[PDB]
Amino acid sequence: PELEVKGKKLRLDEDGFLQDWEEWDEEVAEALAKDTRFSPQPIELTEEHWKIIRYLRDYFIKYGVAPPVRMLVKHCKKEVRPDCNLQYIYKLFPQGPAKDACRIAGLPKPTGCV
């Protein structure tokens, strides 16, 4: 379906992932985060959320896939907080790094992030 943000109508897939992925910015991230068609509840983006979002998006821009969860957790422990395990990632992103975090980070698919 569509997502109205910033005077634009962006294309999402059936799982709520941004298909016009190159149109993404912080504003789009925010609209995705409150998109309750694809999330039980809006997700309030803290700086921790943002650190995770920026990491996923940089990885996709560089490698064309999302990083594996194994690598995400390692990164989070090093750059977010020493106790940021997968459970902590689900605390931030209730549906997980693929269904929530990669979606909000504007990746066109979460492929790789398992």
From TrEMBL:
**GO CC field:** cytoplasm
Q: Which residues form a coiled coil?
A: none
Its BP terms in the Gene Ontology are:
tRNA wobble position uridine thiolation
Question: Sorted alphabetically, which InterPro entries does this protein's record hold?
Answer: DsrC-like_C, DsrC-like_dom_sf, DsrC-like_N, DsrC/TusE
**MF-aspect GO terms:** sulfur carrier activity
Family, similarity comment:
Belongs to the DsrC/TusE family.
Q: What is this protein called?
A: Sulfite reductase, desulfoviridin-type subunit gamma (DsvC)
Name the source organism. Answer: Archaeoglobus fulgidus (strain ATCC 49558 / DSM 4304 / JCM 9628 / NBRC 100126 / VC-16)
